[PDB]
């Protein structure tokens, strides 16, 4: 038995690759399509990967796909749509409080991926501001009975947001909050000590956000979702990644970096459950998609744009492709669960590699005349 | 004789350049058109370079040019075409097993670059899957008498592939296998210990592959073909480089990094020996070229695209240009053989240099109005 | 259950310390009393640590304490003494072959730590030279029935030693050999490929050896026993650490670096089971202790000295102190077995720290007038 | 033959160790007993190593052991003694020119290691000053017919020494000179361009020299004999290492660093062929040994001391031990010649390792009461 008593169970497993901390302490601000994940060993099929992920300290979901509360992406409609497929939705606060109240009533007065509560009503969350008049919003939201709320802000480290956190945690102890936006560990600490139940991480790296180009704030997305998640697991706090998502690759490598759920704003935009309706320009069927920092929210500054993106049909045909993509990525990484993927990442077993710009432009399609890219 | 007794034969030879391990342990994921090879000393003509390279542990070839088994590039046709010019071909498994059987019979029932066996029948290989029903494929392929097989897979480190390797190495001892795809040394170890006779290295970096952009797996190609070849020569195992080939430069610097043969998928596509036939779009005579990970192979995910590329005529006028390109590159590097090129690389004598993006965009044509680029 | 689905089982465990490869790739040639091992977490008592370690690929022992074959330390006497307490002994070859034959017969013709074979005769090994006349030694040793032999040499990488290994592995397949001395991975490879069953690592760092000061060869001991053991576990080969042992600390941190057994030459010298008998100088009861490289082995060069060391009584009172020391060190490191200690070392969980000369001179006793140091 | 066509002849040979330039470009001023040489592979016996080394561009010797011209070590006596055993000697210039003239006549008017010229008279060299009156010395030395001269100086980079080199190279073209002392590459260039035929490298690191402690000049010895030899082989110039020699280890690792011959000042002192005669202090038979920078050479400064060292008998019993030591070190390094040792060093095949102070104090004898160290 001498071949066992040298090391014990584990084979040699040569040291090719870079672990997470030697990748994110080189100082360079890497983003999603700037590194990539090296594979490992698989001993299991694609179908049996369990993507059960946690949203906050008491709310777990069957899929990590959550949506961002903008007025051009989610309502009660894609809320009930993602609640039917395991995710969660948040209702934007850019409306009257009574409209958000009857919106959050419409979803809870309403396929094995459950995401519904103890009394089999659907989990659904919402977004609330941080000004003093927003108390009159979320008290009516509690009468409607919302379960998790998002303290949506450009800067997550205000005196106003931590005062609001102290205002709900004494009044509403069962209710849970989502602090953000944070990008660094200092404001992550300054929210977690206030009693935040989960963070939403990432500012500036949105498909709409130009606040890096306008306010010079923020940081690259992947370094943020690594370091805030690395700090947040010290206290047992999940994080939520926003922005910089264009495909099923970015969300997979995003929650492989320590995130538990990922927040999809543009890639869930222009669906059949999205607000408004379709229109046409140059014969392309597309729906407008607009952030709050654009001046079309209602001496002001603008931190966002107004634009549009082509459609992708219903989510009920779209998010099974997303979970199949997460499912295949967590296959060929080599873990049977997302929890095992983060365990292999923080354990140093799962290894990465930095990627240069030429390997980026060869990572996609190249050296051909024309092509049709259909993902499913 | 004192000028000999200081060092002995060798002159000073100043230390300009970087050797391979100081280039590929900086952590950056370099690819083919991101570094380049510094020249040395030549004392010989272009014609007498011997590009004899090994495919697997008993199969050697007169040229290192092998093709990739897709249904849009090779059949028996370019198999007999590359067997006539020293290479090898593999028949794609995206057909019925009887069609692959009569395909591999058509090539062996059939100009000094030989690549034919002891009984002067042509060397020709094929590709086989990894599912349980594929036993009924490769047993008929053995009745047809194929010599080397490729266990084609997206992820080379499965329990299924090593179980298949154990299934052919006890049944068919003379038959030889090609494991893959691997990109790192760990799965290279986990295939070589099973009894793999040669690897095929490189995933995601294909001209069709978007699985880096979709599944977040893989790594850059040049670092993969350096490190898997650096591990594989410990056990005397050749490797085969796939993807990221656009020209005769990439294959030359690819097999200069430790690869013995290189696998050409797109640059051998759209030939007279390619499947289907030509068609026209915008007046350009081009042939469709499609990978298996595209959904046009037959709830599914897609790891490839369907597209097309312009033609290059017959290979019998094309691969002499490729071997002349390899021949001139191995000239001005300074080695009389590919084996001497790898000996100078692992010995530290042959040296490289990293290249930046501005030196990349000046490496090609620049500072002129228009040009005609004809390679031969 | 959200506190489990972030990481899974494992707590935060901050990154204080250095793992083994970042300690032994800084280039500095660290030795035993130049680094030290940081503690971890214990959840078990001192008595239940299992120090079962492997000698070669089929020979496992209950303690890792083996002795070095010099003519001034071991005979049949300390062979039966260490066989009674789980270890192994080797009989020096600096005698006539008939004397080594009746020595190895005396030990096998002869307290729960067993170290005896299938037919309950004591495991005992011996040492054999490498010259051509030594065939007539080890064939008589096989008639006496020795189980493991040590191809004792100053340089383990000779053509003569690998020819000898090929000479016993075809004649005597059940018999097992110990190659050495090696200090680097190249000669470790050049012995393992010949069929060596276990290495003995470390030259020059002995208490007698001045061959570093005379032949300028060798390397520091701890870097050798890390790197040769790191190479040797690729093929499932144990290593044996010689020299530089003054205390129970050095052997503990020595086999914590990848060694399975450790070879004790001077710290087992001057016992009641040691050759010759005691004598007196300045009223101190001490026994002479001499290596083979001294000119007193029988135009010659000398690689050793002749000297003496004070006594320590019987080993049966001494090696229980040694196993209690190993037992307490493997306690406060935090592993229930030596195999778990090497698993935590190669896994990166067990961490080290380099130590400077001032922390060395404060690591021992300091800042007092006089002291009595009694270890048990 | 595929196992040959991957690399060609050379096996894997793992990358354990440090080559010379990564050891001597870390910036630390390493000396002889601060690093050590890792072994390699041997396929040959000890007796057949050929230590033929070159002194200057036309003078080769059978052993690299030369002596330093002080008035307390060499005369005609140890000149004829080392000429009988292959070396060379130099006669100190601290005498009248007629005394040096009849000294150099006594040696040439006078066992297979030859070191004698074309007309079978003994090779013997001498040392000459650099002041203007020294012309009247070396012209009489040329009438006596000396073959190589040493332009002995504390600082080898004077205008006076290069003017002297221009003064002998036009007058005496067959005569050859030894420039020095140099420690850096700049003064090595400024002597080689003048027409120096070989350098003598190393100031301050002598057993007598306190000019580092007094004039703050010089550098550590091993870095000097690496870098001046690395510059000097660009022009095909041998170098001669002085000082810091206490044993046969230092001269072996000294000429392994690029030196061709090594200059022995103290370890050849106090012999039967040394000047003066023996005397006694505390019952130890010892002979006085004094450098020129001491004030006992004849407002002055002193760069040396006057002292004594115990005897070692005749050199004819002593330098066979030295060549046997060089012979065994060049054995277990793994080269059949000194030229092959320098070829393996500059080729990067021969590798080193830095050594710390604790591994230094364990490199010698330790952990014992008392010992007798006899080297032969
Ligand atoms: N990438 C991102 O995540 C990102 C980045 C920028 C903006 N945004 C979007 O822009 C929206 C608006 O951002 P915003 O926070 O700047 O608008 P806001 O109206 O919520 O706050 C405006 C400013 O007033 C301050 N503030 C907050 N509460 C206050 C109070 N009681 N009294 C006085 N001042 C108070 C804040 O510091 C803020 O700078 C957000 O809903 C967010 O969704 C998102
Ligand atoms: N750049 C590249 O080299 C690259 C990358 C990606 C895909 N591809 C191409 O895509 C093709 C298909 O790739 P694929 O391997 O994902 O498709 P596949 O049908 O061969 O395997 C599908 C999945 O099932 C699993 N599998 C394999 N054998 C199984 C078995 N008996 N039972 C259950 N599951 C099994 C595998 O893990 C795999 O994830 C390949 O032929 C390959 O050529 C190439
Ligand atoms: N720290 C250490 O481990 C260490 C270091 C040095 C020496 N030693 C001790 O010194 C002892 C003697 O060492 P040694 O190997 O130098 O003495 P040796 O008599 O075994 O070998 C002497 C030399 O002859 C060569 N040799 C071996 N077999 C030969 C053969 N058939 N024919 C011709 N030459 C042959 C070897 O290369 C060696 O240099 C060893 O038993 C060893 O225990 C130990
Ligand atoms: N480790 C060493 O190698 C080392 C170091 C220091 C000294 N030494 C010994 O000390 C001895 C004396 O050393 P030294 O060179 O300082 O004594 P020196 O008498 O030869 O020279 C004395 C000084 O005068 C200068 N000099 C040389 N030629 C001159 C000339 N024509 N006119 C005017 N000035 C001139 C020199 O620069 C020197 O500083 C040397 O023989 C040498 O062997 C050896
Ligand atoms: O108006 C805006 N200005 C700046 N950032 C915004 C704005 N609206 C939404 N965002 C961010 O963009 C994210 C959506 O991600 P994306 O659309 O997929 O890039 C949200 O979660 C917000 O963090
Ligand atoms: O469908 C696919 N999805 C991803 N990679 C593919 C697919 N088909 C072929 N490949 C890879 O692409 C390589 C062809 O190289 P290229 O076409 O010259 O870039 C093959 O050897 C495969 O490794
Ligand atoms: O004579 C010798 N010269 C050099 N090394 C020796 C000699 N004799 C024994 N050794 C080494 O010293 C080790 C003993 O370790 P130590 O006595 O505890 O320092 C042995 O295992 C040998 O490797
Ligand atoms: O008087 C002196 N002052 C400083 N260095 C000296 C003196 N005399 C000799 N040396 C140097 O010491 C070397 C002798 O080496 P060692 O005696 O073996 O240390 C000579 O080759 C000179 O370079």
Author numbering:
A (entry chain D), B (entry chain A), C (entry chain E), D (entry chain H): 1 to 110, 233 to 420, 437 to 514
The authors write:
The enzyme IMP dehydrogenase (IMPDH) catalyzes the first committed step in guanine nucleotide synthesis. IMPDH forms stable tetramers, each protomer consisting of a catalytic domain and a regulatory Bateman domain. The enzyme converts IMP to xanthosine monophosphate (XMP) and requires NAD+ as a cofactor for a complex multi-stage catalysis requiring rearrangements of active site loops that close around the substrate upon binding, and then must reopen to allow release of product. Finally, we show that filament assembly tunes sensitivity to GTP inhibition by stabilizing a conformation that reduces affinity for GTP.
To better understand this partially inhibited state, we collected cryo-EM data of IMPDH2 with saturating substrates, 0.5 mM ATP, and 2 mM GTP. Under these conditions, we observed the non-assembly mutant Y12A was 84% inhibited but WT enzyme was only 16% inhibited. We resolved structures of not only the filament assembly interface and several distinct filament segments, but surprisingly, two different free octamers; a canonical free octamer (a dimer of tetramers bound by Bateman domains), and also a small class of free interfacial octamers (a dimer of tetramers bound by the filament assembly interface). The 3.1 Å resolution consensus assembly interface map is identical to the uninhibited and fully inhibited consensus interfaces, including a well-resolved active site with strong density for both substrates; as with the ATP/IMP/NAD+ structures these filaments are actively turning over and we have likely captured many states, which we have modeled simply as IMP/NAD+. The interface between tetramers is formed by the 12 amino-terminal residues of eight protomers, which each extend from the core of the molecule to bind one catalytic domain on the opposite tetramer, in a shallow surface groove formed by a short helix (476-485), two beta strands (51-63), and two short loops (355-360, 379-380). A key tyrosine/arginine interaction (Y12/R356’) anchors the attachment; mutation of either of these residues to alanine was previously shown to abolish assembly, both in vivo and in vitro.
